[PDB]
């Protein structure tokens, strides 16, 4: 007979759920979650020079644009998925119905 009598004292210790890491994919508009950092984009190869203690990359307007992989220490550049407006060119409906 053995017990596992738990106790949580304010800040939890490193005893936590196992981190169910998955595979890594690139060059695809995908959702992501790097160590709690959410967002969607396209992940490519980077030329950054992160010092051995940073994790993120911040641009001028403070939007994240570079993340280091926690499993293997590699820096990945991110990019938003494509978007834009749509415009329709038509002659008059009195003329035809092609667009």
């Amino acid at each position: 007979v053995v017990v596992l009598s738990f106790e949580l004292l304010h800040a939890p210790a490193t005893v936590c759920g196992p981190k169910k890491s998955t595979n890594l994919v690139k060059n695809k508009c995908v959702n992501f979650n790097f160590n709690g950092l959410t967002g969607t984009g396209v992940l490519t190869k980077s030329n950054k020079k992160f010092l051995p203690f940073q994790q993120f990359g911040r641009d001028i307007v403070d939007t994240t644009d570079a993340v280091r992989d926690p499993q293997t220490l590699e820096i990945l550049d991110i990019t938003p998925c494509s978007f834009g407006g749509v415009s329709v060119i038509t002659p008059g409906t009195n003329t035809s119905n092609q667009v």
Partner: protein
């Protein structure tokens, strides 16, 4: 020419990453160690600052009356904690039934009374030949009738 709507490329799949888990708990050897005390002086070492790996607990040696007095065992895998006390002792199955927070009956109130709040979960399985002497293990003692 008219500006009508917008187009957006849909995400294809999902993904999630985390560092190497590692940081294994040096307390699994408390489980299946025939000299994990007998009744009274349980190993004061506690599960702290490693992993809350409760998955191996259910897939461990076949338990007989494993009773969890805390949250449901399904969610116990991922809930975070700070420290986890482990009490190592051997009793009878009827005493295992007698073991409950704020309950009486032999060891449950005479040898090692379970905590009244008892933020924890007991795991019990049959030992038999593992820690039983051929002539009867007289080295193991229990309080028949404690003062209170």
């Amino acid at each position: 020419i008219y500006q009508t709507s917008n187009f957006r490329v849909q995400p294809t799949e999902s993904i999630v990453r985390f560092p190497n888990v590692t940081n294994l708990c040096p307390f699994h050897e408390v489980f299946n160690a025939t000299r994990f005390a007998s009744v009274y002086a349980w190993n004061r070492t506690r599960i702290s600052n490693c992993v809350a790996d409760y998955s191996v607990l259910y897939n461990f040696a076949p338990f007989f009356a494993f009773k969890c007095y805390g949250v449901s065992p399904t969610k116990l895998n991922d809930l975070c904690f700070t420290n986890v006390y482990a009490d190592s002792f051997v009793i009878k199955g009827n005493e295992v039934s007698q073991i409950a927070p704020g309950q009486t009956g032999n060891i449950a109130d005479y040898n090692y009374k379970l905590p009244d709040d008892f933020t924890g979960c007991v795991i019990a399985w049959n030992s038999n030949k593992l820690d039983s002497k051929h002539s009867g293990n007289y080295d193991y003692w229990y309080r028949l009738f404690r003062k209170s």
